[PDB]
Scaffold this active site. Structure first.
Site, PDB file in Angstrom:
ATOM      1  N   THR A   1       7.914  22.944 -17.048  1.00  0.00           N
ATOM      2  CA  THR A   1       6.799  22.004 -17.034  1.00  0.00           C
ATOM      3  C   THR A   1       6.104  21.895 -18.382  1.00  0.00           C
ATOM      4  O   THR A   1       5.387  20.916 -18.615  1.00  0.00           O
ATOM      5  CB  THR A   1       5.782  22.415 -15.969  1.00  0.00           C
ATOM      6  OG1 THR A   1       5.084  23.589 -16.402  1.00  0.00           O
ATOM      7  CG2 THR A   1       6.484  22.715 -14.653  1.00  0.00           C
ATOM      8  N   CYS A   2       6.289  22.875 -19.267  1.00  0.00           N
ATOM      9  CA  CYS A   2       5.569  22.874 -20.535  1.00  0.00           C
ATOM     10  C   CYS A   2       5.978  21.692 -21.407  1.00  0.00           C
ATOM     11  O   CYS A   2       5.125  21.047 -22.027  1.00  0.00           O
ATOM     12  CB  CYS A   2       5.807  24.194 -21.266  1.00  0.00           C
ATOM     13  SG  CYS A   2       5.005  25.620 -20.489  1.00  0.00           S
ATOM     14  N   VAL A   3       7.276  21.392 -21.467  1.00  0.00           N
ATOM     15  CA  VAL A   3       7.801  20.310 -22.287  1.00  0.00           C
ATOM     16  C   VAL A   3       8.508  19.255 -21.437  1.00  0.00           C
ATOM     17  O   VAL A   3       9.100  18.318 -21.975  1.00  0.00           O
ATOM     18  CB  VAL A   3       8.731  20.868 -23.388  1.00  0.00           C
ATOM     19  CG1 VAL A   3       9.070  19.817 -24.449  1.00  0.00           C
ATOM     20  CG2 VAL A   3       8.109  22.097 -24.036  1.00  0.00           C
TER      21      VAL A   3
END
Lengths: 73, 1222, 75, 76
Positions: free
Chosen positions: B1188-1190
């Site tokens: 989910t971070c990138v």
């Protein structure tokens, strides 16, 4: 899988990654967890200076593997 | 170094195995070390030994290690590349003849690394052909290195040497058409550098150009999607510009190859582009055309600062085709931009096209275009190049075609402007030339009409002292609707000011009162009923065209006369720093150090901390004082210095070259309830009377020749929004939707001004933009207002973060803090309250971790915001209206918990005079928490999921006094019908009482006879309790006072007041107090009640489809386009009812919302890759993975769509609210 | 002896389990029930994550108990 | 039929093979002619590496084909 990274000063930072990940993603996670910008970071392994834009599946990294992180000035 | 010496002696040996061990240990020691650890290493002796060892070819395995050792020596420290770079001949000789691929590849990598700082040596060594002797049958990762070294060698090439690249020119020219990206970019850069360096030699440019390079670049440019980046796009267009300008024959050849179609496809195919790209394209178009004569009326160009002519003198079919092809597109580009350089280039190109064309072509091309209006508007401009350009254009155009351009200029207002113009040395000379040319023009040509006179007669009858009835208004409507009045006659005959004083004047001397005038205007324009004949029914006219026509005409007129100034370095700001002097304004120590380091972006808080630590703050470096209360204060003149202010802005305002050069001084110094008794309520405010004023508002200070039109448009917008307050009965509906008031040029100017990094660095947005945004917000769309609010509302770091997140562009790097808190998923309310109370007002971004999780970043924070937003709606707290429902797909313990849900919106519950104080305290505390949470979420660009209603936003924007009976429909639908029917009955009551031809007994009987659906008010048996809440008294004693006909309007007013303003007053006061502890409500005046939802929550839900998905989605790593799994997932995505859409959004992004713009607005595009599995387990029983971070999606390969559907749902449902992998 | 395995949202699956066994056998049974691979499934009991390579005897897991299921998917 | 093989140092070699012969047979013939170990060659024709399990007809190799010989080495 779990990986360990250590620096020259001496510290063991544990990360959990997957074979389909990207080296840039690992560097970004290291930056988030430590604050080191992902530009002075150099990742070496088995004698290579690992490049960016590749995947850990290329470098045959397996479970319980150790990576080396050396900064630059 | 101790092992280094031993490695040196091992290197200087003879045994092959000893040498192999030596080089292996050498590379192992080199790779691990760095500059600090490997200090003192001897290089001047080791490097020649390595070179000698490499200068031997009796073994194939040690050469690879030697090249690797040299490469890692280069990489370890960037200081040895002055002595290490000596074996270039050996590298090149090894490249001439190849025995192993790996050694050649490593040599190529080492040479590419070397070429960055030393390219003259390799250029003299003649390696341009040596590299690419055998360019084919190499690996993919070495071709780019070879092309990069070729480009770096061609970076600085002397005109004397050409034979070093002449052989390889056709090879690169053919290679310019490869399917990859970096190879094409490198080859393009090589050709651009060659053309740029060989600009003064025409023969070399002719040799380089050939005939295949141009066509290959043409097909590369036309083919889409763009494989070439924007910067190299600009570089290629500039290469075209240089070839066209410096070689006329190349320009003619390029024109012969129908470049007009290529330019047409590039510009429109208009595709939105950066200003630099448009500038380069316009420069190319200008350069394709023949040069302007330097003799005649063009002598002013000498002080303001051939083969194409032969081709034109030849068969002019090509020139005519080019002109007819691109004149319209050039004019369209000109009429849709705002920038100092693009406008000038477009003007020069258009002037050349007009000059060099013949009469018939000009007549044909200048048919569906407006030129006279633009010339008239651009004659009067402070920029004294556009005036000269306009004058020259008018002279040429009217000298070529006199008959046609004799009425257009006179009607559109050019002759009057030239007459006005006619009536430390260069400026004087150009002014004198302008005066002389205008005098000659007027004296020579213009020496010696039922619309202007008609408008003058119509506007003569609009004077206030003389009655006019309504014929003047219908005449004005007829002229505006069916005529061809220009924008010069409207100004010349006073009409805007007369209409403004007709609508917004109130005095005893007026012949007719303002109400009658407003009714007459609303009858002539729009079909509202005539005054004195209001129908007994409900007002709902259909026709609204005349108001729209008038608004459009006013907007065009304003666009014609608008003259606002746009203002659009980095290395200077980033390098040079400020020096200031501190002088005492005397208990503190006297300053004697002198200059003080002042960062241009620094704040006064850092200066105060430095002074406190230095010891000047007393009445040795100490950190206890640094580790709130204020003890010292900085002053400049009579104005206090705010803490959230930069020193550069302080110097610019209170105290240019002087800002950065001159020393500045800053002083320092130590630091009866009528409602409850009688039953009377305040009257309903009418917002229109606030707007109806002829004088400008106090917020407006700028001076422009186009202010009266702005005032009239403001008045018209106010009338359109608020017109049902002037009638006893009406329905709430805007005459003209507010999206039709947008001005197409002011928006462009604002967008251009909101893209310069420097004006956001210094926060120097001009006064006109802020004042217009705060006073007349309808002139811009939502995106511009949001951008302006984010830029001007907070510190500079957040503004630059927003700019970087919305427009990828001496490199700027935002600096921000980051403070992390850890919470638990069992007491989310209390922990969230503690976090908000502790760190609510901190200017640092808030990231939240979890106890039993390792994952960190933005995803956990978004998940926390979503969870808190959901938790604030539980039915146990009892804060809003609505019904009680059960959440779909709950957690293990969340099942069975009732939640408050409403179809229309949420509003706060009222309390009267019998509420327990503890309950009120709890409600106020919860409201404070909600306000602080929303205020903090707005700052950090986060999104919430709280479905608020319109009256909530009206209360937020301080609009609580204008809540009429039409606002109950958005709160409670059932009581609205009763209120409406009772109002209908009281209107009948008033109508009956307004007749004097009766008796008292007859009047009483008629009043009693009135019935509601066959029932009377006595039969209804209501009371003074608010309906639905049988515990609140509207007034004291409201239990034994039944409602009758004699008391009904008071009852309705009491109900409305209690349900909208009175009982929900303390709650919203607490909300305002909580919200203002973070940032003031005065910064939300830009928006509207119906637009705050987009700012707070996400965009409106919509169905997804593949057509818009093929714009941001970028698959790679085993999922190239036209694959199977990618299309299966793309098809299965568009089969949801927004429920699984929200599930997928929370699964991948982490929030059940999307940024404004759709899938494109997401800064990290959805990148889909394959997942690596084993050769034993089937790639079917596995779950998809997400980072989910990138937004990195890893989707397993499958064989059936049904399996994809059945596993994605399980992955989304059974993997929520956890981060166990990071 | 019919120990229950409950997923996150609402699902519950019965499972007959031997008194002493490794985690891999229970994982195979859960995979037969649902189909979760041996790369994303984690077992939580009481307040501790069941480490692999041990038996239920050392975890004080008796007959007729409930094991909650968590999938290690997100990042 | 006869084909031509070009290595990293030129040395145009004329080799006689058959359409039904697999790439493994061609490699065996090349080894017999010269002696290059099987684990070092990376035979690439027309920019595409030739799989040992395929035949000449699979790659549309015809008479007077100009094959390219490319060496290979272990990575690490």
């Amino acid at each position: 899988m779990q990986i360990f990274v250590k620096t020259l000063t001496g510290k063991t930072i544990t990360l959990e990654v997957e074979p389909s990940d990207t080296i840039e993603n690992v560097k970004a996670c290291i930056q988030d967890k430590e604050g080191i910008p992902p530009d002075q970071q150099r990742l070496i392994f088995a004698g290579k200076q690992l490049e960016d834009g590749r995947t850990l599946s290329d470098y045959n990294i397996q479970k319980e593997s150790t990576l080396h992180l050396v900064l630059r000035l | 170094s101790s092992k280094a010496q031993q490695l040196l002696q091992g290197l200087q040996a003879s045994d092959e195995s000893q040498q192999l061990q030596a080089v292996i240990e050498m590379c192992q020691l080199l790779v691990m070390g760095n500059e600090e650890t490997l200090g003192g290493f001897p290089v001047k002796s080791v490097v020649p030994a390595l070179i000698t060892l490499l200068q031997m070819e009796h073994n194939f395995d040690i050469m690879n290690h030697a090249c690797r050792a040299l490469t890692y020596m280069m990489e370890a420290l960037p200081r040895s590349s002055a002595v290490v770079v000596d074996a270039i001949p050996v590298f090149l000789e090894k490249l001439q003849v190849i025995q192993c691929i790996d050694v050649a590849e490593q040599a190529l990598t080492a040479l590419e690394m070397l070429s960055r700082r030393h390219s003259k040596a390799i250029l003299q060594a003649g390696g341009l052909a040596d590299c690419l002797l055998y360019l084919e049958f190499f690996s993919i990762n070495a071709q780019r290195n070879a092309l990069a070294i070729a480009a770096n060698c061609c970076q600085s090439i002397t005109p004397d040497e050409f034979h070093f690249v002449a052989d390889s020119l056709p090879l690169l020219t053919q290679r310019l058409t490869h399917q990859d990206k970096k190879s094409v970019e490198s080859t393009c850069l090589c050709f651009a550098r060659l053309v740029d360096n060989f600009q003064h030699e025409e023969n070399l440019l002719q040799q380089v150009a050939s005939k295949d390079l141009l066509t290959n670049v043409q097909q590369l440019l036309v083919v889409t999607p763009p494989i070439l980046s924007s910067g190299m796009f600009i570089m290629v267009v500039r290469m075209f510009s240089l070839m066209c300008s410096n070689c006329p024959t190349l320009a003619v050849q390029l024109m012969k190859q129908n470049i007009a179609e290529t330019l047409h496809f590039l510009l429109c195919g208009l595709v939105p582009r950066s200003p630099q790209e448009l500038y380069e394209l316009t420069s190319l178009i200008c350069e394709l055309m023949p040069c302007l004569p330097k003799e005649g009326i063009f002598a002013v160009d000498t002080m303001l600062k051939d083969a194409r002519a032969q081709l034109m003198k030849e068969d002019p079919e090509l020139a005519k085709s080019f002109i007819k092809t691109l004149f319209g597109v050039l004019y369209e580009v000109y009429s849709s931009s705002a920038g100092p350089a693009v406008r000038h280039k477009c003007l020069r190109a258009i002037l050349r096209i007009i000059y060099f064309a013949d009469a018939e072509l000009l007549k044909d091309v200048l048919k569906n275009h407006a030129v006279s209006s633009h010339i008239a508007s651009m004659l009067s401009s402070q920029d004294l190049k556009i005036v000269v350009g306009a004058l020259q254009m008018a002279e040429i155009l009217m000298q070529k075609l006199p008959d046609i351009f004799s009425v257009y200029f006179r009607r559109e207002g050019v002759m009057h402007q030239v007459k006005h113009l006619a009536e430390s040395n260069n400026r004087e000379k150009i002014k004198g030339w302008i005066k002389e040319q205008a005098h000659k023009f007027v004296e020579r040509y213009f020496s010696s009409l039922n619309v202007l006179q008609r408008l003058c007669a119509a506007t003569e009858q609009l004077n206030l002292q003389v009655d006019g009835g309504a014929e003047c208004l219908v005449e004005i409507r007829s002229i505006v609707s069916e005529s061809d009045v220009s924008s010069f006659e409207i100004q010349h005959s006073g009409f805007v000011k007369q209409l403004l004083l007709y609508l917004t004047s109130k005095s005893e001397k007026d012949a007719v009162s303002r109400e009658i005038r407003l009714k007459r205007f609303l009858h002539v324009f729009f079909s509202s009923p005539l005054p004195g004949e209001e129908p007994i029914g409900r007002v709902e006219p259909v026709g609204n065209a005349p108001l729209l026509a008038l608004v459009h005409k006013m907007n065009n007129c304003l666009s014609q006369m608008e003259q606002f100034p746009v203002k659009v370095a980095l290395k200077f700001f980033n390098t040079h720093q400020l020096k200031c002097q501190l002088q005492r304004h005397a208990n503190v120590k006297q300053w004697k150090g002198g200059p003080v380091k002042i960062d241009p972006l620094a704040l006064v808080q850092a200066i105060e901390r430095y002074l406190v630590v230095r010891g000047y703050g007393r009445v040795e470096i100490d950190e206890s004082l640094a580790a709130v209360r204020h003890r010292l204060q900085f002053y400049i003149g009579e104005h206090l210095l705010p803490y959230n202010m930069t020193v550069y802005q302080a110097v610019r305002q209170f105290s240019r070259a002087g800002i950065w050069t001159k020393t500045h001084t800053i002083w320092y110094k130590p630091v009866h309830d009528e409602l409850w008794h009688d039953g009377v309520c305040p009257s309903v405010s009418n917002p229109l009377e606030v707007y109806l004023i002829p004088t400008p508002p106090e917020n407006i200070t700028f001076e422009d020749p186009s202010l009266d039109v702005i005032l009239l448009l403001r008045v018209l917008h106010a009338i359109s929004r608020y017109w049902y307050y002037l009638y006893d009965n009406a329905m709430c509906k805007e005459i003209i939707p507010t999206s039709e008031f947008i001005n197409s040029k002011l928006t462009a100017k604002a967008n251009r001004q909101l893209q310069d990094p420097l004006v956001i660095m210094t926060g120097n947005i001009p006064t006109w933009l802020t004042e217009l945004g705060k006073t007349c917000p309808f002139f811009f769309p939502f995106d511009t207002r949001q951008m302006l609010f984010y830029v001007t509302a907070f510190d500079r770091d957040r503004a630059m973060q927003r700019l970087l997140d919305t427009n990828p562009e001496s490199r700027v790097a935002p600096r921000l803090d980051r403070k992390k808190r850890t919470v638990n998923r069992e007491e989310l309310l209390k922990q969230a309250e503690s976090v908000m109370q502790d760190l609510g007002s901190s200017r640092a971004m808030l990231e939240i971790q979890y106890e039993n999780e390792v994952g960190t970043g933005l995803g956990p924070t978004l998940e926390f915001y979503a969870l808190v937003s959901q938790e604030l709606q539980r039915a146990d707290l009892g804060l809003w209206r609505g019904e009680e429902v059960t959440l779909s797909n709950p957690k293990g313990s969340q099942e069975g918990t009732k939640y408050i849900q409403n179809l229309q919106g949420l509003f706060a519950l009222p309390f009267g005079r019998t509420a327990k104080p503890a309950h009120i305290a709890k409600v106020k505390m919860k409201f404070r928490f909600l306000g602080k949470l929303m205020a903090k979420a707005i700052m950090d660009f986060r999104l919430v999921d709280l479905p608020l209603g319109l009256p909530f936003y009206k209360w937020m924007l301080r609009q609580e006094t204008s809540l009429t009976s039409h606002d109950l429909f958005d709160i409670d639908p059932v009581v609205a019908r009763s209120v409406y029917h009772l109002e209908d009955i009281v209107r009948q009551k008033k109508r009956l009482e307004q007749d004097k031809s009766q008796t008292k007994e007859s009047l009483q009987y008629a009043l009693e006879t009135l019935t509601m659906n066959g029932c009377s008010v006595e039969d209804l048996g209501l009371d003074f309790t608010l309906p639905g809440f049988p515990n609140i008294e509207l007034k004291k004693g409201g239990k034994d006072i039944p409602v009758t006909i004699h008391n009904l309007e008071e009852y309705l007013r009491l109900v409305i007041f209690w349900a909208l303003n009175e009982g929900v007053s303390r709650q919203f006061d607490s909300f305002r107090d909580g919200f203002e502890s973070v940032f003031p409500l005065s910064h939300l005046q830009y928006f509207y009640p119906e637009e705050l939802d987009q700012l707070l929550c996400g965009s409106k839900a919509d169905t997804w489809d593949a057509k818009t998905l093929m714009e941001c989605c970028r698959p790679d790593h085993g999922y190239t386009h036209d694959s199977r799994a990618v299309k299966f997932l793309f098809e299965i995505l568009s089969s949801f009812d927004n429920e699984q859409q929200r599930l997928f959004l929370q699964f991948v992004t982490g929030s059940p919302r999307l940024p404004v713009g759709g899938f494109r607005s997401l800064n990290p595009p959805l990148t889909i890759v394959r997942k690596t599995f084993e050769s034993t387990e089937n790639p079917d029983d596995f779950l998809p993975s997400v980072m989910t971070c990138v937004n990195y999606l890893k989707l397993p390969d499958y064989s059936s769509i049904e399996i994809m559907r059945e596993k994605l749902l399980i992955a989304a449902r059974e993997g929520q609210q956890s981060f166990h992998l990071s």
